[PDB]
Enzyme design. Structure first.
Site, short mmCIF file in Angstrom:
data_model
loop_
_atom_site.label_atom_id
_atom_site.label_comp_id
_atom_site.label_asym_id
_atom_site.label_seq_id
_atom_site.Cartn_x
_atom_site.Cartn_y
_atom_site.Cartn_z
N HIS A 114 0.83 -1.19 0.00
CA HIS A 114 0.00 0.00 0.00
C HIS A 114 0.87 1.26 0.00
O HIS A 114 0.67 2.17 -0.80
CB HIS A 114 -0.93 -0.02 1.21
CG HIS A 114 -1.84 1.16 1.31
ND1 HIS A 114 -3.16 1.10 0.93
CD2 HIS A 114 -1.63 2.42 1.75
CE1 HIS A 114 -3.73 2.28 1.13
NE2 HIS A 114 -2.82 3.10 1.63
N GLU A 115 1.85 1.29 0.90
CA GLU A 115 2.75 2.42 1.03
C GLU A 115 3.52 2.68 -0.26
O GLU A 115 3.59 3.82 -0.73
CB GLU A 115 3.73 2.20 2.19
CG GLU A 115 3.15 2.48 3.56
CD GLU A 115 2.16 3.63 3.55
OE1 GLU A 115 2.52 4.72 3.05
OE2 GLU A 115 1.03 3.45 4.04
N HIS A 118 1.65 4.49 -2.76
CA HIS A 118 1.75 5.94 -2.56
C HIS A 118 3.11 6.51 -3.00
O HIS A 118 3.16 7.58 -3.61
CB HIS A 118 1.52 6.31 -1.10
CG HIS A 118 0.11 6.17 -0.64
ND1 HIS A 118 -0.98 6.60 -1.38
CD2 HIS A 118 -0.40 5.65 0.50
CE1 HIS A 118 -2.09 6.36 -0.70
NE2 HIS A 118 -1.76 5.79 0.44
N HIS A 124 -5.98 6.62 -3.28
CA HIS A 124 -6.80 5.52 -2.79
C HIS A 124 -7.84 5.02 -3.77
O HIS A 124 -8.25 5.72 -4.70
CB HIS A 124 -7.47 5.91 -1.48
CG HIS A 124 -6.52 5.95 -0.33
ND1 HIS A 124 -6.63 6.85 0.70
CD2 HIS A 124 -5.42 5.21 -0.07
CE1 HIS A 124 -5.65 6.65 1.57
NE2 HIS A 124 -4.90 5.65 1.12
N1 R47 Z 1 -8.50 1.13 10.73
C1 R47 Z 1 -7.73 0.08 10.43
O1 R47 Z 1 -8.19 -0.99 10.04
C2 R47 Z 1 -6.24 0.25 10.60
C3 R47 Z 1 -5.89 0.13 12.07
C4 R47 Z 1 -6.14 -1.24 12.66
C5 R47 Z 1 -5.48 -1.27 14.02
O2 R47 Z 1 -6.06 -0.81 14.98
O3 R47 Z 1 -4.25 -1.77 14.15
N2 R47 Z 1 -5.82 1.57 10.20
C6 R47 Z 1 -5.84 1.95 8.94
O4 R47 Z 1 -6.23 1.22 8.05
C7 R47 Z 1 -5.40 3.36 8.69
C8 R47 Z 1 -6.62 4.28 8.81
C9 R47 Z 1 -6.23 5.75 8.87
C10 R47 Z 1 -7.40 6.65 9.19
O5 R47 Z 1 -7.70 6.72 10.49
O6 R47 Z 1 -7.99 7.24 8.30
N3 R47 Z 1 -4.77 3.60 7.41
C11 R47 Z 1 -3.46 3.53 7.29
O7 R47 Z 1 -2.72 3.24 8.22
C12 R47 Z 1 -2.92 3.85 5.94
C13 R47 Z 1 -1.72 2.97 5.64
C14 R47 Z 1 -2.10 1.60 5.14
C15 R47 Z 1 -3.15 1.05 4.51
C16 R47 Z 1 -2.84 -0.30 4.33
C17 R47 Z 1 -3.63 -1.36 3.66
C18 R47 Z 1 -4.81 -1.00 3.01
C19 R47 Z 1 -5.56 -1.96 2.36
C20 R47 Z 1 -5.12 -3.27 2.35
C21 R47 Z 1 -5.94 -4.27 1.64
C22 R47 Z 1 -7.32 -4.14 1.63
C23 R47 Z 1 -8.11 -5.06 0.96
C24 R47 Z 1 -7.52 -6.10 0.27
C25 R47 Z 1 -6.14 -6.21 0.27
CL1 R47 Z 1 -5.38 -7.50 -0.59
C26 R47 Z 1 -5.34 -5.30 0.94
C27 R47 Z 1 -3.93 -3.64 2.98
C28 R47 Z 1 -3.18 -2.68 3.63
N4 R47 Z 1 -1.66 -0.58 4.81
O8 R47 Z 1 -1.17 0.63 5.34
C29 R47 Z 1 -2.44 5.28 6.04
P1 R47 Z 1 -2.10 6.13 4.48
O9 R47 Z 1 -3.21 5.82 3.53
O10 R47 Z 1 -0.73 5.72 3.93
C30 R47 Z 1 -2.09 7.86 4.91
C31 R47 Z 1 -2.94 8.77 4.29
C32 R47 Z 1 -2.90 10.11 4.66
C33 R47 Z 1 -2.02 10.52 5.65
BR1 R47 Z 1 -1.95 12.33 6.18
C34 R47 Z 1 -1.18 9.61 6.28
C35 R47 Z 1 -1.21 8.28 5.90
ZN ZN Z 2 -3.11 5.08 1.78
#
Ligand code: R47
Ligand code: ZN
Ligand code: CA
Ligand code: CA
Ligand code: CA
Ligand code: ZN
Length: 159
Positions: A114-115, A118, A124
């Protein structure tokens, strides 16, 4: 419409290693995550240990020197800068997460895919099965595949 690298050879360097996993497993997760994107574009990624890499991979905590402070365990897992010099391209992972090679904690490979998306200029996706969907989900790493939307997005930027 995101920023793109204007070259197809891109280097990365792992600045530091999470103590959550061993070094070799971090290297593997990151290498495989780059491979996901090189598989569907003309981009090639080389790891370097010495020199000036395009994409620096960093594990850091809380306020760590940029405008995107982390928040401790949970919440934001990581963040990355789009293509550009210096901090541009760099991918930062929140050390307050517990990084793993598996379903427990936060899977480093999936987060890295994902990173790196970016880091290459992707935004997204609205597809819940796309790796560029905004929120993390664990999927079996062996059966992981980019969705058609991810491939569309990255092929629109490169090639
Ligand atoms: N909410 C969650 O499920 C987990 C936390 C779970 C936990 O508590 O540990 N957090 C997250 O998912 C958070 C949510 C952030 C928010 O609050 O908006 N997202 C983040 O942390 C973003 C980073 C991130 C997203 C993913 C990810 C996404 C989708 C999938 C996936 C999904 C479906 C199918 C498949 Cl095969 C894969 C796998 C990994 N991996 O890292 C942060 P970012 O987008 O880099 C970002 C944007 C803007 C800024 Br400013 C800074 C960073
Ligand atoms: Zn992201
Ligand atoms: Ca966090
Ligand atoms: Ca950089
Ligand atoms: Ca940790
Ligand atoms: Zn950062």
């Amino acid at each position: 419409m995101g920023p793109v690298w204007r070259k197809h050879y891109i280097t990365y360097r792992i600045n530091n290693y999470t103590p959550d996993m061993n070094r070799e497993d971090v290297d593997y997760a990151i290498r495989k995550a780059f491979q996901v994107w090189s598989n569907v574009t003309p981009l090639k990624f080389s790891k370097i240990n010495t020199g000036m890499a395009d994409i620096l991979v960093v594990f850091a905590r809380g306020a760590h020197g940029d405008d995107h402070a982390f928040d401790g365990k949970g919440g934001i897992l990581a963040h990355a800068f789009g293509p550009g010099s210096g901090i541009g391209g760099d991918a930062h992972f929140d050390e307050d997460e517990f990084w793993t090679t598996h379903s427990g904690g936060t899977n480093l490979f999936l987060t890295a895919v994902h990173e790196i998306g970016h880091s290459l200029g992707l935004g997204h996706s609205s597809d819940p099965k796309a790796v560029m969907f905004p929120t993390y989900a664990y999927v079996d790493i062996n059966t992981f595949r980019l969705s058609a939307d991810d491939i569309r997005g990255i092929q629109s930027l490169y090639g």
